[PDB]
Amino acid sequence: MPSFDVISEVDKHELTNAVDQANRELDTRFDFKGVEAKFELEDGKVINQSAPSDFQVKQMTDILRARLLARGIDVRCLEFGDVETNLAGARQKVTVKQGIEQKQAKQLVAKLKEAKLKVEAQINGDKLRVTGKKRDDLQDAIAVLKKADFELPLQFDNFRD
């Protein structure tokens, strides 16, 4: 029975490149002249945005999206926390979501079952392995998973037979 893995992963280097290019891009923008603002990648999972005002962080969000997309990253993996403002300025934590949690995995099994597909899905850590009797059932699952309404970017690899 052939199988593949449904994954939700972000390349750690390209994630670093996008943040570096976003900081470089701020240094060339005229409305951030001498303005204390920065992106900080934390543990390869959290991007901390900080600026004097709520609007300037909103601008940085547009920069961060464009940079991540420019390095091939589906920005739907971004989880934006609340914009926190104190006297020092505005700060916002953006979680770069990776891996398929048990919550989203069971959701992934349920629309597969809902789609009454000839596949058997099993959670294995933060990935979902899909097994079917033939390869075209797997693509039927892959084609369905692509055209779904999901809160996570999905990739597919580790095709075994």
UniProtKB/Swiss-Prot annotation:
SUPFAM superfamilies: YajQ-like. GO terms for cellular component: cytosol. 3',3'-c-di-GMP 1 binds at K33. 3',3'-c-di-GMP 2 binds at K133, R135, D136, D161. Signal peptide: none annotated. GO terms for molecular function: nucleotide binding. Activity is regulated by cyclic di-GMP. Cyclic di-GMP specifically binds to XC_3703, which inhibits the interaction of the XC_2801-XC_3703 complex with DNA and prevents the transcription of the target genes. It comes from the Bacteria. Keywords: Nucleotide-binding, Virulence. Disruption phenotype: The deletion mutant shows reduced virulence to plants and alteration in biofilm formation. Deletion of the gene also leads to alteration in levels of transcript of a number of genes associated with a large range of biological functions. Cyclic di-GMP effector that regulates bacterial virulence and biofilm formation. Binds bis-(3',5')-cyclic diguanylate (cyclic di-GMP or c-di-GMP), an important bacterial second messenger that controls a wide range of cellular processes. In the absence of cyclic di-GMP, XC_3703 positively affects the binding of the transcriptional regulator XC_2801 to its target genes and influences their transcription. The binding of cyclic di-GMP to XC_3703 inhibits the interaction of the XC_2801-XC_3703 complex with DNA, thus preventing the transcription of the target genes. Consists of two domains (domain I and domain II) adopting the same topology, which is similar to that of the RNA-recognition motif (RRM). Domain I is composed of the first N-terminal beta-strand and residues 101 to the C-terminus, and domain II includes residues 11-100. Each domain contains a four-stranded antiparallel beta-sheet packed by two helices from one side. Interacts with the LysR-type transcriptional regulator XC_2801. Belongs to the YajQ family. This is Cyclic di-GMP-binding protein XC_3703. It comes from Xanthomonas campestris pv. campestris (strain 8004).
